[PDB]
Structure 1
Amino acid sequence: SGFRKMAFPSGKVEGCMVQVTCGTTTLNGLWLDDVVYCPRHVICTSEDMLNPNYEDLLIRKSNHNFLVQAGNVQLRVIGHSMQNCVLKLKVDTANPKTPKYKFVRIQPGQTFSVLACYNGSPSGVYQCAMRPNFTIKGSFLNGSCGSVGFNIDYDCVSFCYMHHMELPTGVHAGTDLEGNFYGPFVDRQTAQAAGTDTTITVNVLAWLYAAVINGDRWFLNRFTTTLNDFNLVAMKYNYEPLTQDHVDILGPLSAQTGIAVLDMCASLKELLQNGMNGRTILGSALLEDEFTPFDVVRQCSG
């Protein structure tokens, strides 16, 4: 019993954190085998930030310009290439602590752990979700660039995010490990604003199922709804449209608890209309949306 926002054990990722320095800029890198991955904006200066030509800036760099630091040991850069918004620094030493890994691009609503780093040194780990607006509500300070997002399913580390920047609203933008940004964001100082955020409906429904598994049934009701009537109500509360795909994903939880997906939808509709009324669901006074249907099954069953 119990429900907590849980992150994956960060051990496998800690062994990959290195410090990457170029000129005045110092950020983190992900050392996997003989390649160190880091945001391409490490090559950037003060004036080469609003409109940087990264191809032109990287052509002026040599391998000895990049000081890569793994613990106390200084790694020697032997090559450098750029893939979209990440810099791939080829090094002369392969990381012995390299785990089994994959580079995966996640979709909005997906959750992942974040190992926050400062100067190639891990300071904390937290669980967070890719928001529907493609930003992450992280906890980052200056120097956190190159911190990574991951899911350690079974024994493989699935890298899904590298932190690149903070938007003016305190939310964060970053890329998959191939340098492709999540959202309409670019690595330029230009005015960029996060789109209007929405609540991840499928995750809220999964979290209601985890509450039912933990014996919290106060919010359940005798009503059901059509998928279209639910979405017409959900859109008014700034909730993500629940697709038929989401309904199918919630299938196992619906079977385990004995409450149909559309029945749990009507429960949510009533929760949106009435609120909590001094009550909590899983110790929370708000409808939590950073637990996917897969997270709920993992933490409640195995």
Structure 2
Amino acid sequence: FRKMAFPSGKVEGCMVQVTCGTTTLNGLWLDDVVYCPRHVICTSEDMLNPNYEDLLIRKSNHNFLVQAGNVQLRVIGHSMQNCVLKLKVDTANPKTPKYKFVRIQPGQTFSVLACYNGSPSGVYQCAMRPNFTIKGSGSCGSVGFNIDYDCVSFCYMHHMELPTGVHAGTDLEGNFYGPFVDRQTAQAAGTDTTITVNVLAWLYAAVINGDRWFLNRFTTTLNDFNLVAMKYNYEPLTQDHVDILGPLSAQTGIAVLDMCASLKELLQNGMNGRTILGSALLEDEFTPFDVV
């Protein structure tokens, strides 16, 4: 059961390199706008406490250099939307896919096209952590996305590396995920928790595959499970979570609070050297949708 990323070609055709002063990072070119982190207009000195409103009024179009591979794109206007800079350019991207800007929730998954100075280098599948960071792997301005039948839903743009080595960023409308700011200040990820509904989805995946040994005869209650969950650093499970797992309960004949009893037992006794779909640690970066 591999973690799979979406095919990245539709996004690859949108990556460009944006340079302002000595700073170069990645930008997203859709029709005649290039989107990138606003902190590209920031000198290392400004990043300690910048006034973005005033730093950009002092900038003009000639301060921005946009490169789509070989071709330089001419900037003809610039604007900010929250923490994303919007550079209007004189050429519409002919490779623009059908797309939407969406904002995702903690625990949802997406693919990231990691890029270096407008040159895409690799693609990987993530989950947005409950503490709103991304455990991932210069790359600023790289984006996250899902694809639904020819439509690319952009959900993430990379802005910052946090001192624990995780990543922080915004949606494509410049709204941060998590209590972070685009400033060179002290900031840290909160204590993270495991995404319970994803673990349950992944256990249903093991039952759809031929692995049943963690199933037991018992049930538990939503409240009783949550007390075990909170004691083991796990997101609390909601009646909505139970509802999303409904399809996998109908398919496998394992009710959700039955699977919850299984998980509760695994959290207290381990696997005794057994494995679930190959692994011996519990996977939480597959959503119920991903498993279906």
* Distance of 1:82 and 1:275 partners within structure 2: 50
Deviations along 1:203-224, one digit per CA (max 9) or x if unpaired, are 0000000011111111111110
Taking the aligned partners of 1:284 and 1:137, their CA distance within structure 2 comes to 19
- Cα distance, 1:276 vs. partner? 1.7
Partner deviation per Cα, 1:244-274 (whole Å, 9 max, x = no partner): 0000000000101110000000000001001
Q: Deviations over 1:74-101 (max 9, x none)?
A: 0000000000000000000000000000
Query: SS state of the match for residue 92, structure 2?
Result: coil
CA displacement, residues 16-37 of structure 1 (integer Å, 9 cap, x when unaligned): 0000000000000000000000
- SS of 2:187's partner is coil
- C-alpha displacement of 1:40: 0.3
CA RMSD of the aligned region, Å? 0.5
Residue of structure 2 in register with 1:222 after alignment: 217
The Cα shift of 1:46 comes to 1.3
SS at match of 2:40: helix
Question: Equivalents in 2 of 1:46, 1:120: separation in Å?
Answer: 21
Partner Cα separation in structure 1 for residue 272 and residue 154 of structure 2: 40
State the aligned residue count: 292
How much has 1:64 moved relative to structure 2? 1.2
The Cα offsets for residues 150-208 of structure 1, whole Å up to 9 and x where unpaired, read as 00111100000000011000011000000000010000011001010000000000000
Distance in 2, matches of 1:282 and 1:169, equals 30
SS of the residue corresponding to residue 49 of structure 1 reads helix
Q: What is the deviation of 1:4?
A: 0.7
After TM superposition, the runs of 4+ consecutive aligned structure 1 residues lying more than 4 A away are: none
Match of 1:45 in 2: 43
Q: Which residue of 2 aligns with 1:243?
A: 238
User: Match of 1:54?
Assistant: 52
Percent identity reads 100
SS at structure 2 position matched to 1:97: coil
Deviation, structure 1 residue 285: 1.4
Separation (CA, whole Å) in 2 of partners of 1:153 and 1:221: 37
* 1:149 shift after superposition: 0.3
3-state secondary structure, aligned to 2:202: helix
- Superposed CA offset, 1:134-153 (max 9, x none): 000011xxx10000000011
**TM-score, normalized by length of structure 1?**
0.96
Alpha-carbon offset, residue 279 of structure 1: 1.6
CA distance in 2, matches of 1:293, 1:117: 29
**Offset of residue 283 of structure 1:** 1.5
CA drift of 1:278 comes to: 1.4
Aligned-residue offset at 1:50: 1.3
1:114 is aligned to 112
Q: Distance in 1 between matches of 2:149 and 2:93?
A: 21
| Structure 1 residues not aligned, in runs of 5+ | 298-302
How far 1:284 sits from its partner (Å)?
Answer: 1.3
Stretch moving more, 242-251 or 276-285 = 276-285
Distance between the aligned counterparts of 2:209 and 2:59, measured in 1? 57
Give how far 1:69 is off: 0.4
How far the C-alpha of 1:296 sits from its partner, in A, is 0.2
Tell me whether 1:293 sits opposite 2:288 in the alignment: yes
Corresponding residue for residue 209 of structure 1: 204
Distance 1:86 1:286 in 2: 38
Q: Any stretches of 5+ residues in structure 2 without a counterpart? A: none
CA distance in 2, matches of 1:27, 1:226: 50
The structural deviation recorded for 1:275 is 1.0
Q: CA deviation at 1:280?
A: 1.5
Q: How does 1:100-249 map to 2 (within 5 A)?
A: 100-139=98-137, 143-249=138-244
CA distance in 1 between counterparts of 2:269 and 2:212 reads: 16
Query: Which SS does the other structure have where 1:210 is aligned?
Result: helix
Provide the secondary structure at the position in 1 that maps to 2:47: coil
Give the whole-Å Cα distance in 1 for the aligned partners of 2:183 and 2:218: 50
- Give how far 1:72 is off: 0.3
Confirm whether residue 81 of structure 1 aligns to residue 79 of structure 2: yes
Which secondary structure state, in structure 2, belongs to the residue aligned with residue 276 of structure 1? coil
